[PDB]
Amino acid sequence: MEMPICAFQLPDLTVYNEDFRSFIERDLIEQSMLVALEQAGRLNWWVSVDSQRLLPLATTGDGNCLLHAASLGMWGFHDRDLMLRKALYALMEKGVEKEALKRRWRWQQTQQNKESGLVYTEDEWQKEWNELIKLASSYESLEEFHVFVLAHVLRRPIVVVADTMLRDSEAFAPIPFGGIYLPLEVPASQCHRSPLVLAYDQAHFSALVSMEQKENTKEQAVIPLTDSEYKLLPLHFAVDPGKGWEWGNVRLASVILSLEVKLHLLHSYMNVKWIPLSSK
Asked: Region entry Catalytic: which residue ranges?
């Protein structure tokens, strides 16, 4: 199967080794995240003729450790979260793409509501938006949209590896983090192409190293842009209805993205490669 993939930069461990402070349960947690993601077929699920094994690199922090993990995946140390948090805030509160980002959030949040018939009032819409802003101000876990905003802060696409559901013996709850986050409100010419790649499991974010890095230096690795069933990964908040679009289904049909359009967005913001692979 010819499937779309993309190269990404592995964490520079040389910086990591210098400043590691006790997180004794690191190996135990990392191992459980690896097994969970591999068994569910979300990580290292493919095989190709031309081999790598990605391993979750856990980190300490508050909540799901999104910013600590992002900092780890970007620079090899996690204490850059503070600068990320303020930048994430300023982009939402005073950013020039604020209105457009808000439209993207409300539109997707509206669609997810339609599946459960929970229609929110206008006052409730404005309340939920300020709760999003408050979560980024400077404890409580960041949400899906904050990952989308983080991509804009970095001006770099973000790929999150995760299961789709929380399961008991049999899904009972959804996991919204898995997929592709593109910096769509930043012109592609002003963005980096190589994605920040993170994993999510047991309510925690983590960076991703490769097994080969334990043996010697390895810079690049491969991450798939489809799931293990060869379906393109979800593009988070990829739909922006116009400023003239009124919230009050021919109209709804026009804004929804086709597979061709999704591929075009990926080509615009990522260096997509195609290799023959198959699932395990």
From this structure: 40-279
